[PDB]
Write a protein that binds this ligand. Structure first.
Ligand SMILES: [Zn+2]
Ligand SMILES: [Zn+2]
Lengths: 418, 406
C-alpha cells in the first residue's frame, strides 16, 4: 500500500526529526501552527493522509514537506511574516506539494536514508538539498492560492510574500535557503501576482493568536536573526490593539527570561484582567508563579479555567503546577489520561515520567520515558527502558505482558527500516 | 434664500432637542460655543449665525446642517488629546456649512422629514448620510486654514485621522484623503500648542459627569494629568472632586475642591461644583451667599442659573424668579432657564405664568401643539382683554405659524 508506506515512511522521518533537529515543542506554539495548518488542509482538495505541522528553531527561512502530510516550518517564518495570511500562504504552498505528491512522484526516478539525511540538513542550523521543478512550484502556487482563499486569508499575501523574498535575493549576498528548495524566478512571481489580481479583493486581519505566536517564537525561542527586537515591539505599541497586547506579552516574556519575575508579573496583569480565560497569558501566569515558588496560586487559577477539559495547553500547565507544588499524584491523574489522548506528545510523557518518579513507581517511570525515546527514534533505547521495567514486575502479570508487548511493537517499527 | 434654510435649521434643531440626548449643561455648552464662536469669526464666507451642540453619545461622530447648526458627539473628548484636535473636528465641520456643501447636495433631488429622521438616527445612540471624496477634500483643506488663523495646531487634524484608521460612526459619514491631510498640514507651518484651561476642565466634566459606555474618565488619565502642566493638574483635581460628587461622596468632594476654590475663588467651574456639593448636603444658604459674592454674577449665565436654582432649594422662589425672568429674555433658547422659571412660578402659585414657561420648553423641544395647548390653558386663566391674554394668544399665533411651515 502506497498510502500505508508513505504514512510510516513519514513517521520514520518525523521520529528522526525529533531525535536530532531542534524542534519547538511548546504547547501554545505547536497547537497554533497545527490549528492554522489544519484549517488550510480542511479546505484542500484530495487530502488522503493526516497532516502535522512542525516548527524548527532555525533563523534561516525555509519550508518543506514529505510523505504522510508532514510539513516542516522554520521559526524564521515568523520573522518574515508581517501578517497571518503570508504565513498561511507558505503553509498553503507546502500543503499543495503534498496533495500533488510532488516529492513522492519525484522519487520514483540506502535511498530511504539518503533522503532522510537531506531532510535534517535542511532543518538543522547545520546545512544535499531537495529542489522542486518550477512547474511543480507553479502548481503549488496555483493550488495554494485557492486553498488560501477558501480558508479566508488574503490572496494578495502570497505575491506580497514572494516579492519580499526577492528583495532579499539581490539586496543581500545570501540567497535565503527557502529560495533554493523553492526557486523564485520572476515568471513565478508575475504568475502569482496575476492570479491574486483576478480573485476577489479581501482585506483580512491577522488573528490575535498570530501576533502572540510571533511574539513567543521570537521572544522565548530567540536564536540568531530570530530576535524580538525593541524596534518591532515599539512598532507594535503603535499598531492595532492586537499588536499592543502582543507587544506587552513579549516584554513580560523577556522580563521573565531575565528572571525579573515581579517586573514580568506586573506587565502581564492588565492583559490577564481583560482576558482571564485564554491560554496564552494563563501559560505565562503559571510560568512566573512557579519562578517564585508560588505553585498553589498557579494551581488555583488553572482549576478555575473554563476549557481545562478541552485545551491541552491548560492540561499540561496544571500537571506541571501540581509537580512543582509537591502533589505528583494529582499530576499523574491528569497525565495518565493526557498521554492516552495524545500518544505522540512527548511533553506529556516526560511529565508523566516526572510524576511517576516522584511517586517511586519506577517501572511506570521507565515506561513513560520509554515513550519519549520511541518518539525520538531511539527505539533501541526505548526497548532497553521497557526491558528494565519488565524486570521489576512479576512474570505473568499484565504489567509484564504490557511492557513486553510494547517492546514487540517497537521491534516491528525497527525491522521495517533496516 | 438663507431665510428658509435658517428656518429649516431651526426646525431640525427643535427635532433634535425633543429626541436626541443633548447635553444641556451650562458650563459645557458655554465652552463648546465660546470656542466655536471665535473660531467662526476667522472664516469670512459665513452667511448664518452659528450654534454648536453636544450630544451624549459614546460613538464618535460629527455633522452639521442648515443655519450654521453643528452637532458634536461627546465621544469627541476622549479622542481629542489637546484643544486643537478638538477644534480640528469643529473647523472641519463649520467649513462644511460656510461653503454650503450639504445644501448643494440636496438641491439635486417628504424630503425634509426624511433628512431629519436620518439626522436623528446619526445623532441618537439607538440610514445615514455620506459625502463624496471631493466634498471633504474641500472641507479638510478649507478647514485647516480656518484652524490656523484661530491659533491652534495645524498638525492636530492629521494625527486625529491616523488615530481613526487602525481601528478598522464618523467613518461612514466621513488613504488618499488622509495622505492629503498629512500632505497639506506639513506645508503650512509648525505651531506652539497650549490647550486653554477650560479645555482640560471641559474634558473632565464631559467624561466624568456624562460618562456612558466608552465615555469614561479613567483612573489612567487623571493619574497622567497629575504629572502634566499646572493646568492639567488642576483639571485632574477637578475631575476627582466631580466623580466624588457623582458617587455622592459629598465630604470628599468638598475637601478635594477646597484648594482649587481657595486659589481661584472666581472660577466659574469650581463655583458651579461648590453649589452642587452645598445643595447635595442641604446647605442652600451657604451656596447662595457664595454666589452673591461672585465677581461675574450678573454677567455670566452659568452663575445666574446656579444661584437661581439655589434660591429655589433655599425656599426663595421669588428671588429665583427675578433672576430667571430676566434670564429667559436674554437666553430665549435656553431650556434650562425656562424649566427653572416654571419651577419658580409653580412655587409662587402663579399658574398662568407657570404654563407659559412650560410652553416655551415644549416649543424648544419641537412639540408645538403641546405648547399651544399649555398657552391656551394659561390664556383661559387670565382675564379677557388683559395684557397677559394678548401675549399668550400672540405666542400661540407665533407657534401656529411655525407649524404651518412644515
Ligand atoms: Zn515550493
Ligand atoms: Zn467631513
Amino acid at each position: 500500500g502506497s498510502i500505508g508506506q508513505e504514512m510510516q515512511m513519514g513517521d520514520y522521518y518525523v521520529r528522526q526529526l525529533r531525535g536530532s533537529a531542534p524542534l519547538i515543542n511548546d504547547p501554545l506554539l505547536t497547537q497554533y501552527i497545527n490549528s492554522l495548518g489544519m484549517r488550510l488542509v480542511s479546505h484542500a482538495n484530495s487530502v488522503k493522509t493526516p497532516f502535522h505541522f512542525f516548527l524548527i528553531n532555525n533563523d534561516e527561512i525555509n519550508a518543506f514537506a514529505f510523505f504522510g502530510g508532514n510539513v516542516v516550518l522554520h521559526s524564521a517564518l515568523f520573522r518574515y511574516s508581517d501578517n497571518e495570511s503570508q504565513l498561511a500562504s507558505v503553509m498553503a504552498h507546502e500543503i499543495s506539494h503534498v496533495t500533488q505528491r510532488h516529492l513522492a512522484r519525484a522519487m520514483e526516478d540506502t535511498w530511504v536514508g539518503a533522503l532522510g539525511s537531506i531532510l535534517l540538513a535542511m532543518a538543522s542550523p547545520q546545512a544535499g538539498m531537495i529542489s522542486f521543478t518550477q512547474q511543480n512550484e507553479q502548481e503549488a502556487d496555483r493550488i495554494g492560492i485557492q486553498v488560501l482563499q477558501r480558508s479566508g486569508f488574503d490572496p494578495q499575501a502570497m505575491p506580497t510574500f514572494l516579492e519580499k523574498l526577492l528583495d532579499q535575493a539581490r539586496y543581500s549576498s545570501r540567497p535565503p535557503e527557502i529560495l533554493l528548495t523553492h526557486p523564485l524566478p520572476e515568471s513565478r512571481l508575475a504568475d502569482a501576482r496575476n492570479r491574486a489580481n483576478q480573485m476577489r479583493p479581501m482585506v483580512v486581519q491577522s488573528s490575535e493568536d498570530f501576533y502572540l505566536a510571533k511574539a513567543r517564537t521570537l521572544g522565548m525561542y530567540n536564536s540568531g536573526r530570530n530576535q524580538l527586537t525593541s524596534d518591532l515591539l515599539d512598532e507594535w505599541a503603535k499598531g492595532n490593539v492586537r499588536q499592543q497586547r502582543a507587544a506587552q506579552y513579549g516584554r513580560a516574556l523577556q522580563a521573565m527570561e531575565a528572571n525579573k519575575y515581579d517586573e514580568a508579573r506586573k506587565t502581564l496583569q492588565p492583559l490577564l484582567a481583560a482576558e482571564p480565560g485564554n491560554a496564552w497569558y494563563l501559560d505565562l501566569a503559571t510560568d512566573i508563579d512557579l519562578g517564585q515558588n508560588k505553585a498553589n496560586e498557579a494551581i488555583n487559577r488553572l482549576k478555575n479555567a473554563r476549557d481545562l477539559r478541552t485545551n491541552p495547553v491548560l492540561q499540561l500547565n496544571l500537571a506541571n503546577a501540581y509537580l512543582q507544588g509537591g502533589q505528583p499524584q494529582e499530576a499523574a491523574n491528569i497525565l495518565n489520561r493526557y498521554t492516552f489522548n495524545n500518544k505522540d506528545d512527548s511533553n506529556g510523557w516526560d511529565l508523566l515520567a516526572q510524576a511517576e518518579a516522584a511517586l517511586n513507581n519506577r517501572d511506570q517511570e521507565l515506561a513513560a520515558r520509554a515513550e519519549g525515546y520511541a518518539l525520538a527514534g531511539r527505539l533501541d533505547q526505548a526497548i532497553s527502558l521497557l526491558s528494565s521495567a519488565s524486570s521489576q514486575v512479576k512474570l505473568g502479570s499484565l504489567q509484564q505482558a504490557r511492557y513486553d508487548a510494547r517492546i514487540d511493537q517497537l521491534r516491528q517499527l525497527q525491522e521495517r527500516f533496516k
